[PDB]
Short mmCIF file of C-alpha atoms and ligand atoms in Angstrom, two decimals:
data_model
loop_
_atom_site.label_atom_id
_atom_site.label_comp_id
_atom_site.label_asym_id
_atom_site.label_seq_id
_atom_site.Cartn_x
_atom_site.Cartn_y
_atom_site.Cartn_z
CA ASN A 668 0.25 14.58 -15.54
CA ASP A 669 2.77 17.37 -16.16
CA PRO A 670 2.78 18.56 -19.79
CA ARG A 671 6.48 17.74 -20.16
CA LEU A 672 5.80 14.10 -19.31
CA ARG A 673 2.74 14.14 -21.59
CA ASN A 674 4.77 15.64 -24.48
CA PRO A 675 7.97 13.59 -24.70
CA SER A 676 11.13 15.21 -26.05
CA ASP A 677 14.91 15.11 -25.71
CA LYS A 678 14.71 17.99 -23.22
CA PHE A 679 13.19 15.82 -20.46
CA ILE A 680 14.17 12.14 -20.57
CA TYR A 681 12.49 9.66 -18.24
CA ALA A 682 12.95 5.92 -17.79
CA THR A 683 12.18 2.91 -15.60
CA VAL A 684 13.56 -0.59 -14.99
CA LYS A 685 13.05 -3.15 -17.75
CA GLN A 686 10.60 -5.99 -17.04
CA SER A 687 9.11 -4.47 -13.89
CA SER A 688 5.68 -3.50 -12.59
CA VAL A 689 5.98 0.02 -14.01
CA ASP A 690 6.59 -1.41 -17.48
CA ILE A 691 3.40 -3.47 -17.16
CA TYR A 692 1.48 -0.48 -15.78
CA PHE A 693 2.42 1.78 -18.69
CA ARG A 694 2.02 -0.96 -21.32
CA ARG A 695 -1.52 -1.77 -20.11
CA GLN A 696 -2.63 1.89 -20.25
CA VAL A 697 -4.29 3.01 -23.48
CA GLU A 698 -4.16 6.65 -22.35
CA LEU A 699 -0.39 6.43 -21.77
CA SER A 700 0.80 4.71 -24.97
CA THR A 701 3.19 7.54 -25.86
CA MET A 702 4.54 7.28 -22.31
CA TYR A 703 5.60 3.68 -22.88
CA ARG A 704 6.80 4.53 -26.39
CA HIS A 705 9.23 7.12 -25.02
CA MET A 706 10.13 4.85 -22.10
CA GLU A 707 11.09 1.92 -24.34
CA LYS A 708 14.08 3.84 -25.72
CA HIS A 709 15.86 4.35 -22.38
CA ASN A 710 15.00 1.56 -19.92
CA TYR A 711 17.68 0.41 -17.48
CA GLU A 712 18.90 -2.99 -16.36
CA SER A 713 18.53 -2.38 -12.62
CA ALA A 714 17.26 0.20 -10.15
CA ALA A 715 20.67 0.89 -8.61
CA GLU A 716 22.31 1.70 -11.94
CA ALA A 717 19.32 3.88 -12.87
CA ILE A 718 19.71 5.84 -9.62
CA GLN A 719 23.44 6.18 -10.30
CA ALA A 720 22.72 7.46 -13.81
CA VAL A 721 20.17 9.96 -12.48
CA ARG A 722 22.57 11.31 -9.85
CA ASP A 723 25.38 11.62 -12.41
CA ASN A 724 23.05 13.76 -14.58
CA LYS A 725 22.70 11.10 -17.28
CA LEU A 726 18.94 10.60 -16.79
CA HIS A 727 16.48 13.32 -15.81
CA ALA A 728 13.56 11.56 -14.11
CA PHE A 729 13.31 8.00 -12.76
CA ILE A 730 9.90 6.45 -12.06
CA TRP A 731 9.99 3.75 -9.38
CA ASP A 732 8.36 2.49 -6.20
CA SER A 733 7.93 4.97 -3.37
CA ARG B 468 10.06 -19.78 12.28
CA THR B 469 6.29 -19.36 12.50
CA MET B 470 5.35 -21.88 9.79
CA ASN B 471 8.01 -24.51 10.63
CA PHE B 472 9.78 -24.96 7.29
CA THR B 473 13.39 -24.78 6.12
CA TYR B 474 14.53 -22.71 3.16
CA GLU B 475 17.26 -22.18 0.59
CA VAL B 476 17.52 -18.62 -0.74
CA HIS B 477 18.88 -17.81 -4.18
CA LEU B 478 18.92 -14.73 -6.38
CA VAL B 479 17.10 -14.27 -9.67
CA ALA B 480 19.07 -15.26 -12.77
CA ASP B 481 18.58 -12.21 -15.01
CA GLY B 482 18.11 -9.47 -12.41
CA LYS B 483 14.55 -8.65 -13.50
CA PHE B 484 11.24 -8.81 -11.66
CA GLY B 485 9.42 -10.24 -14.66
CA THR B 486 6.74 -9.51 -17.24
CA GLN B 487 5.35 -11.96 -19.77
CA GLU B 488 6.82 -11.33 -23.22
CA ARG B 489 6.55 -13.01 -26.61
CA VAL B 490 9.21 -15.72 -26.82
CA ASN B 491 11.57 -15.46 -29.80
CA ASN B 492 10.79 -17.37 -33.03
CA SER B 493 7.22 -17.94 -31.82
CA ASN B 494 3.93 -16.12 -31.28
CA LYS B 495 3.16 -16.93 -27.63
CA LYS B 496 4.12 -14.86 -24.59
CA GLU B 497 6.20 -16.38 -21.80
CA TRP B 498 7.18 -15.12 -18.36
CA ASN B 499 10.70 -14.19 -17.26
CA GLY B 500 12.51 -13.12 -14.12
CA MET B 501 11.28 -14.25 -10.72
CA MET B 502 7.83 -14.61 -12.29
CA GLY B 503 9.15 -17.08 -14.85
CA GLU B 504 11.18 -19.00 -12.27
CA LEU B 505 8.20 -19.28 -9.92
CA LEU B 506 5.84 -20.42 -12.68
CA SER B 507 8.31 -22.90 -14.18
CA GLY B 508 9.22 -24.50 -10.84
CA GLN B 509 12.83 -23.47 -10.11
CA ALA B 510 11.55 -21.38 -7.18
CA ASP B 511 8.74 -22.27 -4.79
CA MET B 512 8.10 -18.82 -3.26
CA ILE B 513 9.08 -15.22 -4.00
CA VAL B 514 10.17 -13.20 -0.98
CA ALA B 515 10.98 -9.83 -2.55
CA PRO B 516 9.38 -6.42 -3.15
CA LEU B 517 7.04 -7.73 -5.86
CA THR B 518 4.27 -5.28 -6.72
CA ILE B 519 0.74 -6.71 -6.75
CA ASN B 520 -1.00 -6.14 -10.07
CA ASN B 521 -3.69 -7.74 -12.22
CA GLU B 522 -1.32 -9.29 -14.77
CA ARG B 523 0.64 -11.25 -12.17
CA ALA B 524 -2.40 -12.23 -10.08
CA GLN B 525 -3.79 -14.30 -12.96
CA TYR B 526 -0.89 -16.78 -12.77
CA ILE B 527 0.65 -16.16 -9.32
CA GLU B 528 -1.04 -16.22 -5.93
CA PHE B 529 -0.32 -13.13 -3.81
CA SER B 530 -0.45 -12.99 -0.04
CA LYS B 531 -1.81 -10.06 1.93
CA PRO B 532 0.43 -7.01 1.35
CA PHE B 533 3.23 -6.69 3.89
CA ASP C 658 1.86 16.81 17.79
CA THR C 659 1.83 16.46 21.58
CA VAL C 660 2.07 12.65 21.57
CA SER C 661 4.16 11.68 18.52
CA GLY C 662 3.64 7.93 18.59
CA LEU C 663 1.00 5.33 19.44
CA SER C 664 3.45 3.51 21.73
CA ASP C 665 4.25 6.73 23.60
CA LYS C 666 4.70 6.61 27.37
CA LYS C 667 1.65 8.84 27.81
CA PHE C 668 -0.56 6.06 26.43
CA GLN C 669 1.38 3.00 27.62
CA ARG C 670 1.50 4.57 31.10
CA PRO C 671 -1.75 6.45 31.81
CA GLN C 672 -0.59 7.40 35.33
CA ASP C 673 2.91 8.53 34.35
CA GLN C 674 2.04 12.21 34.90
CA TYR C 675 -0.75 14.89 34.86
CA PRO C 676 -4.17 13.80 35.62
CA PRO C 677 -5.34 10.79 33.63
CA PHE C 678 -5.14 11.32 29.88
CA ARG C 679 -8.66 11.48 28.42
CA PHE C 680 -8.33 9.31 25.32
CA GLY C 681 -10.84 6.72 24.14
CA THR C 682 -12.23 4.84 21.17
CA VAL C 683 -15.46 3.35 19.84
CA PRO C 684 -15.83 -0.20 21.24
CA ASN C 685 -16.66 -3.38 19.31
CA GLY C 686 -14.28 -2.88 16.41
CA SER C 687 -10.90 -3.87 15.06
CA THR C 688 -9.17 -1.05 16.94
CA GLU C 689 -10.50 -2.17 20.32
CA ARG C 690 -9.45 -5.78 19.76
CA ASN C 691 -6.02 -4.69 18.53
CA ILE C 692 -5.51 -2.55 21.63
CA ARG C 693 -6.74 -5.31 23.94
CA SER C 694 -4.49 -7.95 22.38
CA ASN C 695 -1.42 -5.68 22.26
CA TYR C 696 -1.41 -3.05 25.04
CA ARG C 697 -3.27 -4.27 28.12
CA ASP C 698 -2.81 -0.99 30.02
CA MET C 699 -4.11 1.02 27.05
CA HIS C 700 -7.24 -1.12 26.84
CA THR C 701 -7.89 -1.10 30.59
CA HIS C 702 -7.73 2.70 30.61
CA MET C 703 -9.80 3.03 27.42
CA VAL C 704 -12.76 1.31 29.10
CA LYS C 705 -13.44 4.51 31.04
CA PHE C 706 -13.82 6.62 27.88
CA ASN C 707 -16.10 4.25 25.96
CA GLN C 708 -17.03 6.72 23.24
CA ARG C 709 -19.80 6.23 20.68
CA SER C 710 -21.07 7.78 17.46
CA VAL C 711 -17.74 8.99 16.06
CA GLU C 712 -19.33 12.35 15.23
CA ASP C 713 -20.14 12.69 18.94
CA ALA C 714 -16.56 11.76 19.80
CA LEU C 715 -15.39 14.43 17.37
CA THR C 716 -17.62 17.09 18.95
CA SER C 717 -16.46 16.03 22.43
CA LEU C 718 -12.90 16.53 21.20
CA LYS C 719 -13.87 19.99 19.92
CA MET C 720 -15.55 21.03 23.18
CA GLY C 721 -12.64 19.82 25.31
CA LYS C 722 -13.97 16.68 27.00
CA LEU C 723 -11.35 14.61 25.13
CA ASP C 724 -7.80 15.23 23.94
CA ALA C 725 -7.01 12.16 21.79
CA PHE C 726 -9.17 9.83 19.70
CA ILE C 727 -7.94 6.41 18.52
CA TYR C 728 -9.79 5.19 15.44
CA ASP C 729 -9.51 4.18 11.78
CA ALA C 730 -7.09 6.14 9.62
CA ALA C 731 -9.27 6.16 6.49
CA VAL C 732 -12.18 7.78 8.33
CA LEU C 733 -9.95 9.99 10.51
CA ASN C 734 -8.33 11.54 7.44
CA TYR C 735 -11.77 12.32 6.01
CA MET C 736 -12.99 13.74 9.33
CA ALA C 737 -9.91 15.97 9.50
CA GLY C 738 -10.43 17.06 5.90
CA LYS C 739 -13.97 18.38 6.39
CA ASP C 740 -13.19 20.18 9.64
CA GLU C 741 -13.83 23.87 10.27
CA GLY C 742 -11.11 24.00 12.93
CA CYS C 743 -8.92 21.63 10.88
CA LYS C 744 -8.05 19.06 13.50
CA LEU C 745 -4.76 17.31 12.88
CA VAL C 746 -3.61 13.70 13.09
CA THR C 747 -0.67 13.12 15.46
CA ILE C 748 2.06 13.01 12.81
CA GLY C 749 1.99 14.79 9.44
CA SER C 750 1.03 11.59 7.62
CA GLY C 751 -0.65 10.22 10.74
CA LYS C 752 2.06 7.56 11.07
CA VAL C 753 -0.55 4.89 10.37
CA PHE C 754 -0.18 2.06 12.89
CA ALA C 755 -1.04 -1.57 12.12
CA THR C 756 -1.50 -0.83 8.44
CA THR C 757 -4.29 -2.91 6.88
CA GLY C 758 -6.99 -2.31 4.29
CA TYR C 759 -10.70 -2.40 3.62
CA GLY C 760 -11.82 -5.66 2.07
CA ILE C 761 -14.92 -7.36 0.72
CA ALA C 762 -15.91 -10.12 3.13
CA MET C 763 -16.91 -13.45 1.58
CA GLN C 764 -17.96 -16.90 2.67
CA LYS C 765 -15.06 -19.25 3.31
CA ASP C 766 -13.87 -21.16 0.22
CA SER C 767 -16.33 -19.41 -2.10
CA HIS C 768 -16.15 -19.04 -5.89
CA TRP C 769 -16.53 -15.29 -6.43
CA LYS C 770 -13.24 -14.60 -4.62
CA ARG C 771 -10.84 -14.95 -7.54
CA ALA C 772 -12.97 -13.00 -10.02
CA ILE C 773 -13.62 -10.16 -7.57
CA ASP C 774 -9.94 -10.02 -6.60
CA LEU C 775 -8.95 -9.71 -10.26
CA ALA C 776 -11.63 -7.08 -10.87
CA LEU C 777 -10.48 -5.01 -7.89
CA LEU C 778 -6.87 -5.24 -9.06
CA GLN C 779 -7.96 -4.13 -12.53
CA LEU C 780 -9.83 -1.17 -11.04
CA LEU C 781 -6.74 -0.19 -9.05
CA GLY C 782 -4.59 -0.55 -12.17
CA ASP C 783 -6.71 1.67 -14.43
CA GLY C 784 -6.87 4.55 -11.95
CA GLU C 785 -10.60 4.32 -11.27
CA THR C 786 -9.90 3.98 -7.55
CA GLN C 787 -7.87 7.20 -7.64
CA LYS C 788 -10.81 8.94 -9.33
CA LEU C 789 -13.14 7.64 -6.61
CA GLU C 790 -10.71 8.89 -3.95
CA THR C 791 -10.71 12.34 -5.55
CA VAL C 792 -14.51 12.43 -5.87
CA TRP C 793 -15.45 10.96 -2.48
CA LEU C 794 -12.64 11.44 0.08
CA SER C 795 -11.38 14.93 -0.78
CA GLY C 796 -10.70 17.38 2.03
CA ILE C 797 -10.79 21.14 2.41
CA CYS C 798 -7.61 21.78 4.40
CA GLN C 799 -5.92 18.46 3.59
CA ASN C 800 -3.56 20.20 1.14
C1 LIG D 901 8.43 -28.76 12.96
O1 LIG D 901 8.77 -29.77 12.00
C2 LIG D 901 9.70 -30.75 12.49
C3 LIG D 901 10.01 -31.67 11.33
O2 LIG D 901 8.86 -31.90 10.53
C4 LIG D 901 9.09 -31.48 13.69
O3 LIG D 901 10.04 -32.40 14.21
C5 LIG D 901 9.40 -33.69 14.32
O4 LIG D 901 8.61 -33.77 15.51
C6 LIG D 901 7.92 -35.02 15.66
C7 LIG D 901 7.08 -34.90 16.91
O5 LIG D 901 6.74 -33.55 17.18
C8 LIG D 901 8.91 -36.17 15.70
O6 LIG D 901 8.20 -37.40 15.75
C9 LIG D 901 9.82 -36.15 14.48
O7 LIG D 901 10.83 -37.14 14.60
C10 LIG D 901 10.47 -34.77 14.33
N1 LIG D 901 11.28 -34.72 13.12
C11 LIG D 901 12.46 -34.09 13.06
C12 LIG D 901 13.16 -34.14 11.74
O8 LIG D 901 12.93 -33.51 14.03
C13 LIG D 901 8.68 -30.48 14.76
O9 LIG D 901 8.00 -31.14 15.82
C14 LIG D 901 7.76 -29.41 14.16
N2 LIG D 901 7.42 -28.42 15.17
C15 LIG D 901 6.22 -28.35 15.76
C16 LIG D 901 5.22 -29.38 15.33
O10 LIG D 901 5.96 -27.50 16.61
C1 NAG D 902 15.09 -15.11 -32.89
O1 NAG D 902 14.13 -14.63 -33.83
C2 NAG D 902 14.71 -14.04 -35.00
C3 NAG D 902 13.56 -13.52 -35.83
O2 NAG D 902 13.08 -12.28 -35.33
C4 NAG D 902 15.56 -15.07 -35.74
O3 NAG D 902 16.20 -14.44 -36.85
C5 NAG D 902 16.61 -15.66 -34.81
O4 NAG D 902 17.30 -16.71 -35.46
C6 NAG D 902 15.95 -16.20 -33.54
N1 NAG D 902 16.95 -16.71 -32.61
C7 NAG D 902 16.90 -17.94 -32.09
C8 NAG D 902 18.02 -18.29 -31.15
O5 NAG D 902 16.00 -18.73 -32.36
C1 NAG D 903 -20.44 -2.59 22.25
O1 NAG D 903 -20.76 -3.87 22.81
C2 NAG D 903 -21.32 -3.80 24.12
C3 NAG D 903 -21.50 -5.22 24.60
O2 NAG D 903 -22.03 -6.04 23.56
C4 NAG D 903 -22.63 -3.01 24.09
O3 NAG D 903 -23.14 -2.88 25.41
C5 NAG D 903 -22.39 -1.63 23.49
O4 NAG D 903 -23.63 -0.95 23.34
C6 NAG D 903 -21.70 -1.74 22.13
N1 NAG D 903 -21.40 -0.42 21.60
C7 NAG D 903 -21.92 0.05 20.47
C8 NAG D 903 -22.86 -0.86 19.75
O5 NAG D 903 -21.64 1.17 20.04
N1 LIG D 904 -13.21 -0.59 10.07
C1 LIG D 904 -13.38 -0.91 11.48
C2 LIG D 904 -14.39 0.04 12.11
C3 LIG D 904 -13.79 1.09 13.03
C4 LIG D 904 -13.19 0.49 14.28
O1 LIG D 904 -13.96 0.00 15.13
O2 LIG D 904 -11.95 0.52 14.43
C5 LIG D 904 -13.82 -2.35 11.65
O3 LIG D 904 -14.50 -2.91 10.79
O4 LIG D 904 -13.49 -3.00 12.64
#
């Protein structure tokens, strides 16, 4: 619910894993259409490579299971 | 051990959990990942961190959450 | 955080030290059957402190007649939330033991099961359950 995540921009980039539960969750939300629209540009193949990209300062925020 | 059955474990082909998506050169949506392999018949059971959600519960039967 | 664990030696061994630990639970429930089937010594000691009327157990804890109460996590979090003395669960997140959930009982092999399961999953997906949590199970000193 943070305004940065509600107002997508190049400043704060966020992504998930392609073809996962988070993709379905954001695609099925009418209120979060822009969320999925921004997400679609930067999804990752796997969780491990997404974590590696986040640690190496290539991706800002990574949404995944707790 | 508890249910008295033998098993053969294999990994998913494309490294994705699976969401139904429109198949190329067609208009219908088809499943992929472990979802697609379970529905098609290549796999008989998914033992993996698969998130329970409404979209998957329509085609797949979910056990009690572990 | 005097205990720090359900399987602690204080509970598994009531007579390990100090005079007997005064911990009990409301009988005829899932917790009592779980304790009976798992920890025989726990259950045999708990028979002495057969509490009732969880509000009364809470007030007995406040007065000092009891030092530990074993019960359901969903109701214990709410009871801690609306507490003037702000009683605390053993571990920061309570370290929920034997994690299960609240369900809608049905007759065996019924018809409504699939539709109600899908409807509940839809409600969880659309965030209505989170709204109900915020509007019904909020606490004062829970944050
Ligand atoms: C688990 O399954 C195996 C195989 O289905 C059972 O082994 C059979 O046991 C019966 C009698 O109990 C024998 O007549 C068969 O010849 C056995 N088959 C094999 C391949 O060993 C086993 O008994 C089952 N475990 C149980 C029922 O506890
Ligand atoms: C996939 O669909 C595109 C049309 O979007 C088509 O040009 C292409 O030939 C199709 N590929 C296959 C393998 O059918
Ligand atoms: C629990 O069950 C016992 C035996 O049936 C009964 O005596 C006792 O009153 C019950 N406790 C309740 C209902 O709180
Ligand atoms: N939810 C519990 C009630 C509380 C308890 O007795 O643990 C049950 O239905 O068994």
